[PDB]
Design a binder for this molecule. Sequence first.
Ligand SMILES: O=C(O)c1cc(C(=O)O)c2c(n1)C(=O)C(=O)c1cc(C(=O)O)[nH]c1-2
Ligand SMILES: [Ca+2]
Lengths: 71, 573
Amino acid sequence: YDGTHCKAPGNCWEPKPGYPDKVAGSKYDPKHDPNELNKQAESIKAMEARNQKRVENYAKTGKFVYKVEDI
Amino acid sequence: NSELDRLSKDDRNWVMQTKDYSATHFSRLTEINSHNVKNLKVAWTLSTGTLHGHEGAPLVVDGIMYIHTPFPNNVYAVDLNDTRKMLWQYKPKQNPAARAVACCDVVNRGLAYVPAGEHGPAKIFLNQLDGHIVALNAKTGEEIWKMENSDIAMGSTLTGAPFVVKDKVLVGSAGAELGVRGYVTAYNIKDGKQEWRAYATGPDEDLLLDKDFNKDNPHYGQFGLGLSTWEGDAWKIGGGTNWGWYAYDPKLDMIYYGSGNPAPWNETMRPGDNKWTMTIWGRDADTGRAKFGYQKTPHDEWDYAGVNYMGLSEQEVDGKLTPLLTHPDRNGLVYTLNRETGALVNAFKIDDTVNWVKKVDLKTGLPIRDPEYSTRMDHNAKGICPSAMGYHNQGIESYDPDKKLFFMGVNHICMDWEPFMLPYRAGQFFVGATLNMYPGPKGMLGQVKAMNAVTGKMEWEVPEKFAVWGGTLATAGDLVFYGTLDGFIKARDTRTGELKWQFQLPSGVIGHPITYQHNGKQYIAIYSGVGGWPGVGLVFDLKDPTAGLGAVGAFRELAHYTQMGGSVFVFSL
Ligand SMILES: O=C(O)c1cc(C(=O)O)c2c(n1)C(=O)C(=O)c1cc(C(=O)O)[nH]c1-2
Ligand SMILES: [Ca+2]
């Protein structure tokens, strides 16, 4: 693995000698909990929905209000 | 923002952290110069009211200095005709738990500004550690709007300064050490409404790519690579946060920045190029759509997080005047690209001891790896230069366009590194390596260097006891100013590197100096307040040499020179 042998344009990763192609089912399987993986993205969706609440409320009233329960 | 650009050409002002849209950090002021800087004295000071690392620097606009602090990110305005009084203050109420998910001290790289217009009054912008972007009235400090960008429950913070372009303010990301997937966001300055959001990993729609993305250099890679260079869903926690600095070319209407490192540090857990972490981007201002993207460190093995500053310049490339970007990365290479096409012009070693890479092949764009300095599970890799701290970190550097030289604060830090397996839990650290760090082969921890970025020619190089972390300021007085971790501000002759002046500040510096004119007189200002990564050992009373992600052992002597502090120093003749 010297970085110069490319499967495709912008894809040059090769396993180091003795290491596997894929980690799933190997001794270095990260075994990620797909529920943990998805948490970031769901918390972003909820930040965006609250933000759009604050924007609409500024549009409707001319007054900015942060706390979404006081809207 | 063309009004902001215009204020930036006025030497009375310092309107953005980078000084101007090209990040020149260069002043035309010459009252203070190489032959009288020896007489520079302290004119006045302020306290910030906090300890911890003070990054970034003050802004000055229309006769008002704006000051900011590490967490809880207090902001103060000071009228330069009455330097003892605070015109206004803004004191955020933030969850103290934000501190526990910051990797590298509770630093903040500072404020942005936009002048009055249709949106309407002049505003100060603040990123809080707790993930909020806040718009303040620049004259009164009144909160105009506030939005949530990042969620600390996910280990997602903000430390990078906001950045204003046109009617937008851009907000980065932080937390790759806790598995945060990087993203940058544009908000409307009137409203705080989200305009666009571009992720560093994942499907093409999230990446936000122009249909002509990488047209000029297809061999960098184009579409689908944000998924195909990862195995399965490992991109969803894959890092690439952007906590550094930006640049903008108004004429091309393009924004430049770097995405950080892939998570975890354990390379074996994330096979593949891990695009588009570790990438230099050029994105359309209005839509955020990338026109180009160059990955400097495919499949990072060393945490060379690619967030460093972008310095724009216009220089001859084979006899033709070419619009460029210059970019001293963590990986110890200094990159210069054509800022219109993205084409690689040069990529040379900031110091000859860089060893992870033998050289970058300029025609393929590919760094030729040396397997002797790779990292991998079930191996303790020894003597890798640079270390995870980089041969260059978050300091904004400077460019003298008369001399065609960049002046840079450089680090000289090498490491050993062994990964370990670990689970990802949202809200917990997701690092997966143990490091020891120490001086590079030349034996000191820092340097200051002057170089030509097209040719790679080193004009001068001088040593420093500690890494030079905070960046630099250059002037037409033939001087480069910088602060040191051990607590000096210093000035060097820009022709030779000769030391012309130094002053003993109370604490170490990790931000940059500014200069401005007020009422016909030149001033220099800087923060003093050590912290950030080099300072973790002293800030948190740490003694294990592998703690602070490896930094503690390398910087254990720092605490013999400096304590914590928080002040602003202003100098004049
Ligand atoms: O992965 C990340 O998102 C992240 C965040 C930060 C931060 O927010 O300050 C740093 C780093 N990485 C990092 O690699 C790093 O070397 C670093 C140094 C510092 C500092 O200000 O001294 N912060 C950070
Ligand atoms: Ca990092």
